[PDB]
C-alpha cells in the first residue's frame, strides 16, 4: 500500500470515542470488549507478547519505542518482588486530549488492557497514574474498574483463567513532569515528581523497586483488540515500523477542533481537511503546525504540504510524531508569542532536579520573552541555539529535549521573522 | 584531590608572637615557611637522612573504594531507600 | 507564590485540624492500595483528601499526613509545595483555573480571562471579596480541542465563549451548579460540523477475531 487514510469504522480500535454509546460494562461488552479474555489469559505471556511484537506497535506515549520489545524485558523469572503495570495516563502534553477521551468514554478498554498487559509482564497488578485534574475521568474508571471487579473480570481468578490481578488509580497533582516514568513512578512512591537517571531502567527497579512497565493509555488499551484481532490486522495498517491506528487531536486554528481515530501514515494536510475541517481561512491561510504537541518542532507549510503523520517521515522532516497532538497556526498568529508561551510552559513544567533544565529553560524563557518583544540583537539567535544545544542531550529525562526542540524548529524555520521583530524593535525604539 | 598527589616535608611550628608596634606575627624560625615537594616517601626520607633532620612518616591515606549504585536509592527491601531525591 | 511558611495566626502548627471519621476510612482505603512497608505512597492522596476535607491546606494537615503515615513532616511539605494543586492559602470557594497555553492561547482564551476578571472585579491570582472566587492562571488541562476551556473544582467548562463564561459564573453566584462540558453545540470531541468518523454502528462481540482463539 501506498497511500494510507481513510479508515473504516470496522478498523476503528476506540470506538465509542465520543461518548455517543454506552460507556460501562453492558455497553462496553455490546461492543467487543471483555470478549474471550480468558482465552487470551490462557495461552501465556508468550503469545501475547508475540501478539503485540509481530503487530508493530510502537509507544503511543510518543517516543516509539517497540511495544512487545518493550514489554519483554519483564519476561523474566521473579527474585522474590512483585511485578507491576504501571499505566501512563497523566497526558500533560499541551495539544493532547486523547488519553482523556479513552478514559473517559472506553475505560472498560482500558481495564481489559492492563489485565492483558499485565498477563503478558506477569504483573501483579495495575496502577493506573491518572492526572488530578481528570477527576471526573478519574471517577468513571472506578466505576468501570468496580463494575470489573463486580463481574469477576479482573482481581481474584480474573476473567476466570487462575491469574491474579488488580487495577490501582492513582491520581496526581499537577505535574507535568508526573508523567515522564521514572517522575510517575516517584510520584506513585510518595514523593516529589523527580525523573530517575536511567539505568536502572523500570523493568530492573521501578515502582517501590519492583520490576515495572510504564505504558500509555493508548499502547494498552489497543493490546485486546491486537490479541483478538491478531498482530497481522493491526501491522497491516501504516507504513513498516508505522503499524497501526492512531489517535489524533488537531487543535488550534481549524474550523473544527476534534480528536480522531485514523491510519498511521495519513498526510498531515488530508487529515486537517478531512477530519477537522481544515485551516481557517483556507490551507494558504495555513502558517504553521506543530505536529506531535508542544515538544515536537514546528513545521512550516511547504512542509506539511506532503508529509506524512507516522514516526519515521516526521523524523525526516525533522520533527517527531510525539503525541499525535496536531496544533494549527494560522497566518494571523504571533508565532515567537506563541513558542514563547510553549516555553514560558515548560519552565512552569519542570521539576528542577538538574542543572541544564532548572537553569537553561529559565534562561530560555527570558530570551524568548524578550524576542517576543524583539528587544534583543540577531547575536542573540544563534546564541540562543547553542543554549538550547546545551540542555538537548545533558539533562536526566527528555523536557530538556521537549523544551530545547521548540525553540530550535522556530529559529529553524523563522529566523527572519525573529531578525525584523528585532530590527523593527530598534528603530522605533532608538 | 590534586594536592594529595606528593609528599610534603615540613617542620615543626615554632613560636610566633606578637611585634609590639603594629601586632605583626614576628618569628624567630628560619625553617618556619621551608615546605619541600617529593615524589616518593623514599625521596623525603633520603634527604632528611642526608640532612641530619629527625623525621617522623606519616603513611599515604588513600581513600578505600567505595560500593555506589543509583539503583540502590530506590531498593524494594532495604534500608537505603532516599527518602527524598 | 512563596516556597516557604510563616506561622501566621491563621496558619500554625496550632491550627484546628482532623479528619472526620469517614475520612479515616477512606485514609486506611489508600494506604491499603500500596504495599506493606511503602507507606509514603499514599502521601498523595490522603494530602489531597486534606484539601477536600478543609479546602487548602495549612500546616497542620501537612504535619497530620505526616503523623499518620509515620513519614518526616520535611517530605510532606516537599510534596505539598512541588504540586501546583495543593493549596497552601486559602482560595475561594470556587476556583477558576483559566488554561492560557498555546492551543488555547490560539483559540482565544484571553478573551475569556478578561472576561472573568472584568465579571468578578478581580484579576488573575486574586480573590472576589466574599471568598467565592479565585481566579488563578494554569497550564494546559489536556482540553485542547475544547479550547478554550476553564476548570471549577472539578469540572472542565469547554468550548467557552465570554457570554458562557458569564452565565457559568452567574449561576454559580446564584448557588447552582452547572453543567460539566462543552458550551457550544457538540457534546464531548467530535467535529463540529457533524461526524466525521463512527457513523456506523459498532460490531460487536467476535468481529475480527482471528482464529486459533
Ligand atoms: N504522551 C505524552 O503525553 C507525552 C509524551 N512525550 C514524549 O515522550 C518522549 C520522551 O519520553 P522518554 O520515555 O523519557 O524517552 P524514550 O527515549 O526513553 O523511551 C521510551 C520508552 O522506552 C524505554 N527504553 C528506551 N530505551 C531503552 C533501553 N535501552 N532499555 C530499556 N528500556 C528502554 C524507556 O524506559 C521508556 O519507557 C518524547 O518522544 C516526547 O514526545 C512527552 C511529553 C508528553
Ligand atoms: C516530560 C515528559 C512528560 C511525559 N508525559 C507523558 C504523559 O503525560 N503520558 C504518557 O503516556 N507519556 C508521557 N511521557 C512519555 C513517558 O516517558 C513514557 O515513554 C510513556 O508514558 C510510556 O512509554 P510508551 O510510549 O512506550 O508506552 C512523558 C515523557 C516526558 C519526558
Ligand atoms: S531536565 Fe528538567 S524535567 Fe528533567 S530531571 Fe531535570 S529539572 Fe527534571
Ligand atoms: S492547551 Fe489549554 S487544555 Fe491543553
Known amino acids: 500500500k501506498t497511500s494510507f487514510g481513510s479508515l473504516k469504522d470496522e478498523d476503528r480500535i476506540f470506538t465509542n470515542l465520543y461518548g455517543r454509546h454506552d460507556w460501562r460494562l453492558k455497553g462496553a461488552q455490546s461492543r467487543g470488549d471483555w470478549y474471550k479474555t480468558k482465552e487470551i489469559l490462557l495461552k501465556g505471556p508468550d503469545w501475547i507478547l508475540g501478539e503485540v511484537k509481530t503487530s508493530g506497535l510502537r509507544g503511543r506515549g510518543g517516543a516509539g519505542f517497540p511495544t512487545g520489545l518493550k514489554w519483554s524485558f519483564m519476561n523474566k523469572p521473579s527474585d522474590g518482588r512483585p511485578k507491576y503495570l504501571v499505566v501512563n495516563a497523566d497526558e500533560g502534553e499541551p495539544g493532547t486530549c486523547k488519553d482523556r477521551e479513552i478514559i473517559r468514554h472506553d475505560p472498560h478498554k482500558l481495564v481489559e488492557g492492563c489485565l492483558v498487559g499485565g498477563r503478558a509482564m506477569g504483573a501483579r497488578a495495575a496502577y493506573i497514574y491518572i492526572r488530578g485534574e481528570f477527576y471526573n475521568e ?15 473480570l479482573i482481581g481474584k481468578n480474573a476473567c476466570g483463567s487462575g491469574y491474579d490481578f488488580d487495577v490501582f488509580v492513582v491520581r496526581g497533582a499537577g505535574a507535568y513532569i508526573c508523567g515522564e516514568e521514572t517522575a510517575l513512578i516517584e510520584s506513585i512512591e510518595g514523593k516529589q515528581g523527580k525523573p530517575r537517571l536511567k539505568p536502572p531502567f523500570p523493568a530492573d527497579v ?153 537553569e537553561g529553560v529559565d534562561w530560555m524563557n527570558k530570551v524568548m520573552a524578550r524576542f517576543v518583544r524583539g528587544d534583543a540583537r540577531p547575536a542573540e539567535i544563534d546564541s540562543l541555539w547553542e543554549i538550547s544545544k546545551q540542555i538537548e542531550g545533558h539533562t536526566i529525562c527528555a523536557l530538556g529535549d521537549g523544551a530545547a526542540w521548540p525553540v530550535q524548529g522556530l529559529i529553524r524555520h523563522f529566523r527572519p521573522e525573529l531578525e525584523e521583530r528585532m530590527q523593527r524593535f530598534a528603530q522605533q525604539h532608538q | 584531590v590534586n594536592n594529595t598527589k606528593k609528599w610534603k616535608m615540613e617542620f615543626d611550628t615554632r613560636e610566633r608572637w606578637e611585634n609590639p608596634l603594629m601586632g605583626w606575627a614576628s618569628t624567630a624560625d628560619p625553617l618556619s615557611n621551608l615546605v619541600l615537594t ?43 531507600r532516599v527518602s527524598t531525591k | 507564590a512563596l516556597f516557604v511558611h510563616r506561622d501566621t495566626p491563621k496558619n500554625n502548627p496550632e491550627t484546628p485540624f482532623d479528619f472526620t471519621p469517614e475520612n479515616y476510612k477512606r485514609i486506611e482505603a489508600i494506604v491499603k492500595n500500596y504495599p506493606e512497608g511503602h507507606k509514603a505512597a499514599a502521601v498523595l492522596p490522603v494530602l489531597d483528601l486534606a484539601q477536600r476535607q478543609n479546602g487548602w491546606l495549612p500546616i497542620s494537615a501537612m504535619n497530620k499526613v505526616a503523623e499518620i503515615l509515620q513519614v518526616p513532616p520535611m517530605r ?138
Open chain 1, 138 to 152: 478519574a471517577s468513571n474508571l472506578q466505576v468501570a474498574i468496580r463494575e470489573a471487579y463486580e463481574a469477576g
Open chain 3, 76 to 213: 510532606v511539605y516537599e510534596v505539598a509545595t512541588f504540586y501546583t494543586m495543593y493549596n497552601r492559602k486559602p482560595v475561594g470557594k470556587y476556583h477558576i483555573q483559566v488554561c492560557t497555553t498555546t492551543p488555547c492561547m490560539l483559540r482565544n482564551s484571553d478573551s475569556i480571562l478578561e472576561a472573568i476578571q472584568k465579571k468578578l472585579g478581580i484579576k488573575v491570582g486574586e480573590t472576589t471579596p466574599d471568598k467565592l472566587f479565585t481566579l488563578i492562571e494554569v497550564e494546559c488541562l489536556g482540553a485542547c480541542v475544547n479550547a478554550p476551556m476553564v476548570q471549577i473544582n472539578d469540572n472542565y467548562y469547554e468550548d467557552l465563549t465570554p457570554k458562557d463564561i458569564e452565565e457559568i459564573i452567574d449561576e454559580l453566584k446564584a448557588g447552582k451548579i452547572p453543567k460539566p462540558g462543552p458550551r457550544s453545540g457538540r457534546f464531548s470531541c467530535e467535529p463540529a460540523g457533524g461526524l466525521t468518523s463512527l457513523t456506523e454502528p459498532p460490531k460487536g462481540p467476535g468481529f475480527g477475531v482471528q482464529a486459533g482463539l
Open chain 1, 206 to 358: 521501578g515502582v517501590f523497586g519492583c520490576p515495572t512497565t510504564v505504558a500509555n493509555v493508548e499502547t494498552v488499551a489497543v493490546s485486546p483488540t491486537i490479541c483478538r484481532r491478531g498482530g497481522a490486522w493491526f501491522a497491516s495498517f501504516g507504513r513498516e515500523r508505522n503499524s497501526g491506528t492512531k489517535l489524533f487531536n488537531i487543535s488550534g486554528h481549524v474550523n473544527n477542533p476534534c480528536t480522531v481515530e485514523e491510519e498511521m501514515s495519513v498526510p498531515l494536510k488530508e487529515l486537517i481537511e478531512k477530519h477537522a475541517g481544515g485551516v481557517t481561512g483556507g490551507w494558504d491561510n495555513l502558517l504553521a503546525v506543530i505536529p506531535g504537541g508542544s515538544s515536537t518542532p514546528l513545521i512550516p507549510k511547504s512542509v506539511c504540504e506532503t508529509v506524512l503523520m507516522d514516526f519515521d517521515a516526521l523524523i525526516q522532516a525533522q520533527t517527531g510524531l510525539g503525541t499525535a497532538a496536531v496544533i494549527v497556526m494560522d497566518r494571523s498568529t504571533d508565532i515567537v508569542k506563541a513558542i514563547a508561551r510553549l516555553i514560558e510552559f515548560y519552565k512552569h513544567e519542570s521539576c528542577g532536579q538538574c542543572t541544564p533544565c532548572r
Open chain 2, 38 to 80: 617529593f615524589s616518593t616517601k623514599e625521596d623525603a626520607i633520603a634527604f632528611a637522612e642526608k640532612n641530619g633532620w629527625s623525621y617522623d612518616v606519616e603513611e599515604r591515606k588513600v581513600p578505600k573504594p567505595k560500593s555506589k549504585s543509583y539503583g540502590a536509592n530506590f531498593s524494594w527491601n532495604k534500608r537505603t
